[PDB]
Amino acid sequence: NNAFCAGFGLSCKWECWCTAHGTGNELRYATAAGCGDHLSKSYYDARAGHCLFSDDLRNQFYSHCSSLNNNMSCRSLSK
């Protein structure tokens, strides 16, 4: 849900991050720049350097990583 996800990083349904073209390396700073305060209802997890959300904000996050010339990878948090 949005309350617990954006608030504590709990009950989130998606975990996404920007990745570098060519190497596929995770890019924490690019990820942070489009998460938390930059994307309503998202939760930036500084330990993993990943962006989490309950609502499906993949389109919005995709646009962000792309604007920086990066790719995006997401994990569905499936039960």
PDB file of N, CA and C in Angstrom:
ATOM      1  N   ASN A   1       0.881  -1.207   0.000  1.00  0.00           N
ATOM      2  CA  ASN A   1       0.000   0.000   0.000  1.00  0.00           C
ATOM      3  C   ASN A   1       0.892   1.221   0.000  1.00  0.00           C
ATOM      4  N   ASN A   2       0.327   2.370  -0.373  1.00  0.00           N
ATOM      5  CA  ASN A   2       1.099   3.607  -0.441  1.00  0.00           C
ATOM      6  C   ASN A   2       1.592   4.154   0.886  1.00  0.00           C
ATOM      7  N   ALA A   3       0.760   4.072   1.926  1.00  0.00           N
ATOM      8  CA  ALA A   3       1.110   4.589   3.248  1.00  0.00           C
ATOM      9  C   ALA A   3       2.357   3.927   3.829  1.00  0.00           C
ATOM     10  N   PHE A   4       2.364   2.610   3.878  1.00  0.00           N
ATOM     11  CA  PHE A   4       3.505   1.896   4.415  1.00  0.00           C
ATOM     12  C   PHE A   4       4.720   1.843   3.480  1.00  0.00           C
ATOM     13  N   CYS A   5       4.470   1.860   2.179  1.00  0.00           N
ATOM     14  CA  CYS A   5       5.565   1.810   1.225  1.00  0.00           C
ATOM     15  C   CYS A   5       6.340   3.122   1.199  1.00  0.00           C
ATOM     16  N   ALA A   6       5.647   4.224   0.944  1.00  0.00           N
ATOM     17  CA  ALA A   6       6.302   5.526   0.900  1.00  0.00           C
ATOM     18  C   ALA A   6       6.808   5.910   2.284  1.00  0.00           C
ATOM     19  N   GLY A   7       6.145   5.401   3.323  1.00  0.00           N
ATOM     20  CA  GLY A   7       6.560   5.710   4.677  1.00  0.00           C
ATOM     21  C   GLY A   7       7.711   4.873   5.226  1.00  0.00           C
ATOM     22  N   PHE A   8       7.640   3.556   5.073  1.00  0.00           N
ATOM     23  CA  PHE A   8       8.664   2.680   5.634  1.00  0.00           C
ATOM     24  C   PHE A   8       9.373   1.757   4.650  1.00  0.00           C
ATOM     25  N   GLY A   9       8.939   1.747   3.395  1.00  0.00           N
ATOM     26  CA  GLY A   9       9.524   0.837   2.422  1.00  0.00           C
ATOM     27  C   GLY A   9       8.935  -0.561   2.611  1.00  0.00           C
ATOM     28  N   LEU A  10       7.753  -0.610   3.219  1.00  0.00           N
ATOM     29  CA  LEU A  10       7.054  -1.862   3.491  1.00  0.00           C
ATOM     30  C   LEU A  10       5.781  -1.967   2.671  1.00  0.00           C
ATOM     31  N   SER A  11       5.456  -3.183   2.243  1.00  0.00           N
ATOM     32  CA  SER A  11       4.271  -3.477   1.430  1.00  0.00           C
ATOM     33  C   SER A  11       4.338  -2.850   0.017  1.00  0.00           C
ATOM     34  N   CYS A  12       5.559  -2.650  -0.475  1.00  0.00           N
ATOM     35  CA  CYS A  12       5.775  -2.093  -1.805  1.00  0.00           C
ATOM     36  C   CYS A  12       5.592  -3.226  -2.810  1.00  0.00           C
ATOM     37  N   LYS A  13       5.262  -2.882  -4.050  1.00  0.00           N
ATOM     38  CA  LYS A  13       5.042  -3.882  -5.090  1.00  0.00           C
ATOM     39  C   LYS A  13       6.104  -3.880  -6.189  1.00  0.00           C
ATOM     40  N   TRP A  14       6.911  -2.827  -6.247  1.00  0.00           N
ATOM     41  CA  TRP A  14       7.954  -2.706  -7.256  1.00  0.00           C
ATOM     42  C   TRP A  14       9.232  -2.153  -6.655  1.00  0.00           C
ATOM     43  N   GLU A  15      10.368  -2.653  -7.123  1.00  0.00           N
ATOM     44  CA  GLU A  15      11.673  -2.174  -6.689  1.00  0.00           C
ATOM     45  C   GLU A  15      12.419  -1.925  -7.993  1.00  0.00           C
ATOM     46  N   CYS A  16      12.731  -0.665  -8.276  1.00  0.00           N
ATOM     47  CA  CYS A  16      13.410  -0.306  -9.519  1.00  0.00           C
ATOM     48  C   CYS A  16      14.678   0.527  -9.334  1.00  0.00           C
ATOM     49  N   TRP A  17      15.511   0.580 -10.379  1.00  0.00           N
ATOM     50  CA  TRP A  17      16.741   1.365 -10.352  1.00  0.00           C
ATOM     51  C   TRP A  17      17.240   1.611 -11.765  1.00  0.00           C
ATOM     52  N   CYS A  18      17.973   2.706 -11.943  1.00  0.00           N
ATOM     53  CA  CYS A  18      18.549   3.031 -13.248  1.00  0.00           C
ATOM     54  C   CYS A  18      19.840   2.239 -13.387  1.00  0.00           C
ATOM     55  N   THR A  19      20.148   1.829 -14.619  1.00  0.00           N
ATOM     56  CA  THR A  19      21.358   1.062 -14.922  1.00  0.00           C
ATOM     57  C   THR A  19      22.102   1.711 -16.075  1.00  0.00           C
ATOM     58  N   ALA A  20      23.414   1.548 -16.069  1.00  0.00           N
ATOM     59  CA  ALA A  20      24.270   2.102 -17.106  1.00  0.00           C
ATOM     60  C   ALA A  20      24.179   1.321 -18.414  1.00  0.00           C
ATOM     61  N   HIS A  21      24.169   2.032 -19.535  1.00  0.00           N
ATOM     62  CA  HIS A  21      24.152   1.367 -20.837  1.00  0.00           C
ATOM     63  C   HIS A  21      25.485   0.640 -20.961  1.00  0.00           C
ATOM     64  N   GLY A  22      25.502  -0.481 -21.666  1.00  0.00           N
ATOM     65  CA  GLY A  22      26.757  -1.184 -21.875  1.00  0.00           C
ATOM     66  C   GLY A  22      27.272  -2.072 -20.773  1.00  0.00           C
ATOM     67  N   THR A  23      27.336  -1.566 -19.550  1.00  0.00           N
ATOM     68  CA  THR A  23      27.815  -2.385 -18.449  1.00  0.00           C
ATOM     69  C   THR A  23      26.682  -3.001 -17.638  1.00  0.00           C
ATOM     70  N   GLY A  24      25.531  -2.334 -17.638  1.00  0.00           N
ATOM     71  CA  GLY A  24      24.404  -2.806 -16.859  1.00  0.00           C
ATOM     72  C   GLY A  24      24.585  -2.545 -15.364  1.00  0.00           C
ATOM     73  N   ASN A  25      25.577  -1.738 -14.996  1.00  0.00           N
ATOM     74  CA  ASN A  25      25.828  -1.420 -13.602  1.00  0.00           C
ATOM     75  C   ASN A  25      24.697  -0.576 -13.015  1.00  0.00           C
ATOM     76  N   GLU A  26      24.386  -0.821 -11.747  1.00  0.00           N
ATOM     77  CA  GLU A  26      23.358  -0.076 -11.044  1.00  0.00           C
ATOM     78  C   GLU A  26      23.898   1.326 -10.788  1.00  0.00           C
ATOM     79  N   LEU A  27      23.035   2.328 -10.913  1.00  0.00           N
ATOM     80  CA  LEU A  27      23.453   3.711 -10.714  1.00  0.00           C
ATOM     81  C   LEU A  27      22.651   4.337  -9.586  1.00  0.00           C
ATOM     82  N   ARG A  28      23.191   4.294  -8.371  1.00  0.00           N
ATOM     83  CA  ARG A  28      22.475   4.835  -7.228  1.00  0.00           C
ATOM     84  C   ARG A  28      22.141   6.314  -7.268  1.00  0.00           C
ATOM     85  N   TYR A  29      23.053   7.147  -7.754  1.00  0.00           N
ATOM     86  CA  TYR A  29      22.781   8.580  -7.789  1.00  0.00           C
ATOM     87  C   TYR A  29      21.717   8.962  -8.800  1.00  0.00           C
ATOM     88  N   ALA A  30      21.697   8.276  -9.936  1.00  0.00           N
ATOM     89  CA  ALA A  30      20.675   8.516 -10.955  1.00  0.00           C
ATOM     90  C   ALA A  30      19.339   8.027 -10.375  1.00  0.00           C
ATOM     91  N   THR A  31      19.365   6.887  -9.690  1.00  0.00           N
ATOM     92  CA  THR A  31      18.164   6.338  -9.071  1.00  0.00           C
ATOM     93  C   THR A  31      17.606   7.292  -7.990  1.00  0.00           C
ATOM     94  N   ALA A  32      18.469   7.779  -7.096  1.00  0.00           N
ATOM     95  CA  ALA A  32      18.052   8.697  -6.024  1.00  0.00           C
ATOM     96  C   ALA A  32      17.436   9.987  -6.584  1.00  0.00           C
ATOM     97  N   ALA A  33      18.001  10.484  -7.689  1.00  0.00           N
ATOM     98  CA  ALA A  33      17.533  11.709  -8.330  1.00  0.00           C
ATOM     99  C   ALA A  33      16.104  11.634  -8.873  1.00  0.00           C
ATOM    100  N   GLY A  34      15.553  10.431  -9.001  1.00  0.00           N
ATOM    101  CA  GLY A  34      14.193  10.314  -9.494  1.00  0.00           C
ATOM    102  C   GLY A  34      13.299   9.572  -8.517  1.00  0.00           C
ATOM    103  N   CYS A  35      13.685   9.580  -7.246  1.00  0.00           N
ATOM    104  CA  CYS A  35      12.948   8.866  -6.209  1.00  0.00           C
ATOM    105  C   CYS A  35      12.748   9.719  -4.953  1.00  0.00           C
ATOM    106  N   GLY A  36      11.953   9.207  -4.019  1.00  0.00           N
ATOM    107  CA  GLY A  36      11.696   9.921  -2.783  1.00  0.00           C
ATOM    108  C   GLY A  36      10.955  11.211  -3.063  1.00  0.00           C
ATOM    109  N   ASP A  37      11.555  12.332  -2.676  1.00  0.00           N
ATOM    110  CA  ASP A  37      10.947  13.647  -2.888  1.00  0.00           C
ATOM    111  C   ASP A  37      10.702  13.966  -4.358  1.00  0.00           C
ATOM    112  N   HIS A  38      11.367  13.238  -5.243  1.00  0.00           N
ATOM    113  CA  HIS A  38      11.222  13.494  -6.662  1.00  0.00           C
ATOM    114  C   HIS A  38      10.118  12.699  -7.317  1.00  0.00           C
ATOM    115  N   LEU A  39       9.530  11.768  -6.584  1.00  0.00           N
ATOM    116  CA  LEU A  39       8.470  10.955  -7.156  1.00  0.00           C
ATOM    117  C   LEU A  39       7.478  10.617  -6.054  1.00  0.00           C
ATOM    118  N   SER A  40       6.342  11.310  -6.063  1.00  0.00           N
ATOM    119  CA  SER A  40       5.319  11.111  -5.049  1.00  0.00           C
ATOM    120  C   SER A  40       4.980   9.638  -4.902  1.00  0.00           C
ATOM    121  N   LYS A  41       4.837   9.207  -3.655  1.00  0.00           N
ATOM    122  CA  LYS A  41       4.499   7.832  -3.309  1.00  0.00           C
ATOM    123  C   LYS A  41       5.644   6.839  -3.455  1.00  0.00           C
ATOM    124  N   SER A  42       6.860   7.318  -3.653  1.00  0.00           N
ATOM    125  CA  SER A  42       7.985   6.404  -3.786  1.00  0.00           C
ATOM    126  C   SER A  42       8.798   6.422  -2.502  1.00  0.00           C
ATOM    127  N   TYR A  43       9.639   5.410  -2.332  1.00  0.00           N
ATOM    128  CA  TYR A  43      10.496   5.302  -1.173  1.00  0.00           C
ATOM    129  C   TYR A  43      11.887   4.978  -1.692  1.00  0.00           C
ATOM    130  N   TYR A  44      12.861   5.822  -1.369  1.00  0.00           N
ATOM    131  CA  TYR A  44      14.234   5.574  -1.783  1.00  0.00           C
ATOM    132  C   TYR A  44      14.945   4.800  -0.687  1.00  0.00           C
ATOM    133  N   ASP A  45      15.397   3.604  -1.021  1.00  0.00           N
ATOM    134  CA  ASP A  45      16.115   2.788  -0.061  1.00  0.00           C
ATOM    135  C   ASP A  45      17.613   3.010  -0.266  1.00  0.00           C
ATOM    136  N   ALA A  46      18.209   3.846   0.584  1.00  0.00           N
ATOM    137  CA  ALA A  46      19.633   4.159   0.497  1.00  0.00           C
ATOM    138  C   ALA A  46      20.584   2.977   0.732  1.00  0.00           C
ATOM    139  N   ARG A  47      20.114   1.915   1.391  1.00  0.00           N
ATOM    140  CA  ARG A  47      20.966   0.753   1.635  1.00  0.00           C
ATOM    141  C   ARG A  47      21.200   0.001   0.338  1.00  0.00           C
ATOM    142  N   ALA A  48      20.141  -0.208  -0.437  1.00  0.00           N
ATOM    143  CA  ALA A  48      20.255  -0.915  -1.713  1.00  0.00           C
ATOM    144  C   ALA A  48      20.458   0.036  -2.879  1.00  0.00           C
ATOM    145  N   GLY A  49      20.166   1.319  -2.668  1.00  0.00           N
ATOM    146  CA  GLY A  49      20.283   2.306  -3.727  1.00  0.00           C
ATOM    147  C   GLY A  49      19.177   2.067  -4.740  1.00  0.00           C
ATOM    148  N   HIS A  50      18.004   1.639  -4.260  1.00  0.00           N
ATOM    149  CA  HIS A  50      16.857   1.331  -5.130  1.00  0.00           C
ATOM    150  C   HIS A  50      15.615   2.161  -4.805  1.00  0.00           C
ATOM    151  N   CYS A  51      14.735   2.314  -5.795  1.00  0.00           N
ATOM    152  CA  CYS A  51      13.479   3.062  -5.639  1.00  0.00           C
ATOM    153  C   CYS A  51      12.315   2.071  -5.535  1.00  0.00           C
ATOM    154  N   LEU A  52      11.490   2.228  -4.511  1.00  0.00           N
ATOM    155  CA  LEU A  52      10.352   1.340  -4.305  1.00  0.00           C
ATOM    156  C   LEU A  52       9.014   2.068  -4.342  1.00  0.00           C
ATOM    157  N   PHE A  53       7.983   1.385  -4.833  1.00  0.00           N
ATOM    158  CA  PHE A  53       6.628   1.944  -4.859  1.00  0.00           C
ATOM    159  C   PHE A  53       5.537   0.880  -4.873  1.00  0.00           C
ATOM    160  N   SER A  54       4.358   1.251  -4.360  1.00  0.00           N
ATOM    161  CA  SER A  54       3.185   0.371  -4.291  1.00  0.00           C
ATOM    162  C   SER A  54       2.394   0.546  -5.585  1.00  0.00           C
ATOM    163  N   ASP A  55       2.007   1.780  -5.894  1.00  0.00           N
ATOM    164  CA  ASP A  55       1.325   2.076  -7.162  1.00  0.00           C
ATOM    165  C   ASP A  55       2.375   1.798  -8.254  1.00  0.00           C
ATOM    166  N   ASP A  56       1.931   1.479  -9.463  1.00  0.00           N
ATOM    167  CA  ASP A  56       2.867   1.197 -10.555  1.00  0.00           C
ATOM    168  C   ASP A  56       3.365   2.496 -11.162  1.00  0.00           C
ATOM    169  N   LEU A  57       4.524   2.950 -10.705  1.00  0.00           N
ATOM    170  CA  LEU A  57       5.113   4.187 -11.203  1.00  0.00           C
ATOM    171  C   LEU A  57       6.261   3.906 -12.176  1.00  0.00           C
ATOM    172  N   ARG A  58       6.292   2.697 -12.724  1.00  0.00           N
ATOM    173  CA  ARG A  58       7.356   2.315 -13.647  1.00  0.00           C
ATOM    174  C   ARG A  58       7.471   3.238 -14.860  1.00  0.00           C
ATOM    175  N   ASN A  59       6.350   3.736 -15.381  1.00  0.00           N
ATOM    176  CA  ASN A  59       6.406   4.617 -16.544  1.00  0.00           C
ATOM    177  C   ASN A  59       7.118   5.890 -16.197  1.00  0.00           C
ATOM    178  N   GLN A  60       6.794   6.416 -15.029  1.00  0.00           N
ATOM    179  CA  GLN A  60       7.390   7.646 -14.570  1.00  0.00           C
ATOM    180  C   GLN A  60       8.863   7.461 -14.286  1.00  0.00           C
ATOM    181  N   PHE A  61       9.201   6.360 -13.623  1.00  0.00           N
ATOM    182  CA  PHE A  61      10.596   6.087 -13.297  1.00  0.00           C
ATOM    183  C   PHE A  61      11.386   5.782 -14.564  1.00  0.00           C
ATOM    184  N   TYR A  62      10.737   5.138 -15.532  1.00  0.00           N
ATOM    185  CA  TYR A  62      11.376   4.801 -16.806  1.00  0.00           C
ATOM    186  C   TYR A  62      11.773   6.087 -17.530  1.00  0.00           C
ATOM    187  N   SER A  63      10.844   7.036 -17.563  1.00  0.00           N
ATOM    188  CA  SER A  63      11.066   8.324 -18.206  1.00  0.00           C
ATOM    189  C   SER A  63      12.277   9.018 -17.567  1.00  0.00           C
ATOM    190  N   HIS A  64      12.360   8.939 -16.237  1.00  0.00           N
ATOM    191  CA  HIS A  64      13.467   9.528 -15.497  1.00  0.00           C
ATOM    192  C   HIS A  64      14.820   8.898 -15.853  1.00  0.00           C
ATOM    193  N   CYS A  65      14.931   7.572 -15.776  1.00  0.00           N
ATOM    194  CA  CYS A  65      16.207   6.948 -16.108  1.00  0.00           C
ATOM    195  C   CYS A  65      16.574   7.259 -17.570  1.00  0.00           C
ATOM    196  N   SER A  66      15.590   7.210 -18.467  1.00  0.00           N
ATOM    197  CA  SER A  66      15.821   7.500 -19.877  1.00  0.00           C
ATOM    198  C   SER A  66      16.293   8.932 -20.117  1.00  0.00           C
ATOM    199  N   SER A  67      15.741   9.896 -19.383  1.00  0.00           N
ATOM    200  CA  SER A  67      16.153  11.284 -19.563  1.00  0.00           C
ATOM    201  C   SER A  67      17.658  11.446 -19.274  1.00  0.00           C
ATOM    202  N   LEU A  68      18.188  10.562 -18.434  1.00  0.00           N
ATOM    203  CA  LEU A  68      19.592  10.589 -18.057  1.00  0.00           C
ATOM    204  C   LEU A  68      20.432   9.666 -18.941  1.00  0.00           C
ATOM    205  N   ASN A  69      19.801   9.096 -19.955  1.00  0.00           N
ATOM    206  CA  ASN A  69      20.443   8.177 -20.885  1.00  0.00           C
ATOM    207  C   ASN A  69      20.860   6.877 -20.219  1.00  0.00           C
ATOM    208  N   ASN A  70      19.987   6.366 -19.363  1.00  0.00           N
ATOM    209  CA  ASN A  70      20.225   5.125 -18.641  1.00  0.00           C
ATOM    210  C   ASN A  70      19.060   4.182 -18.900  1.00  0.00           C
ATOM    211  N   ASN A  71      19.261   2.909 -18.589  1.00  0.00           N
ATOM    212  CA  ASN A  71      18.199   1.925 -18.729  1.00  0.00           C
ATOM    213  C   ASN A  71      17.574   1.797 -17.350  1.00  0.00           C
ATOM    214  N   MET A  72      16.533   0.981 -17.228  1.00  0.00           N
ATOM    215  CA  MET A  72      15.848   0.768 -15.950  1.00  0.00           C
ATOM    216  C   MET A  72      15.579  -0.712 -15.741  1.00  0.00           C
ATOM    217  N   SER A  73      15.793  -1.187 -14.517  1.00  0.00           N
ATOM    218  CA  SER A  73      15.517  -2.573 -14.157  1.00  0.00           C
ATOM    219  C   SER A  73      14.560  -2.545 -12.990  1.00  0.00           C
ATOM    220  N   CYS A  74      13.583  -3.438 -12.991  1.00  0.00           N
ATOM    221  CA  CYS A  74      12.650  -3.508 -11.880  1.00  0.00           C
ATOM    222  C   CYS A  74      12.452  -4.951 -11.469  1.00  0.00           C
ATOM    223  N   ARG A  75      12.074  -5.142 -10.207  1.00  0.00           N
ATOM    224  CA  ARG A  75      11.765  -6.455  -9.641  1.00  0.00           C
ATOM    225  C   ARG A  75      10.328  -6.347  -9.138  1.00  0.00           C
ATOM    226  N   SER A  76       9.491  -7.315  -9.480  1.00  0.00           N
ATOM    227  CA  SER A  76       8.128  -7.313  -8.981  1.00  0.00           C
ATOM    228  C   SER A  76       8.206  -7.956  -7.600  1.00  0.00           C
ATOM    229  N   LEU A  77       7.640  -7.308  -6.589  1.00  0.00           N
ATOM    230  CA  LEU A  77       7.678  -7.857  -5.238  1.00  0.00           C
ATOM    231  C   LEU A  77       6.435  -8.717  -5.036  1.00  0.00           C
ATOM    232  N   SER A  78       6.469  -9.883  -5.670  1.00  0.00           N
ATOM    233  CA  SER A  78       5.374 -10.846  -5.658  1.00  0.00           C
ATOM    234  C   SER A  78       5.292 -11.839  -4.494  1.00  0.00           C
ATOM    235  N   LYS A  79       4.075 -11.984  -3.972  1.00  0.00           N
ATOM    236  CA  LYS A  79       3.792 -12.931  -2.908  1.00  0.00           C
ATOM    237  C   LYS A  79       3.192 -14.169  -3.619  1.00  0.00           C
TER     238      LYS A  79
END
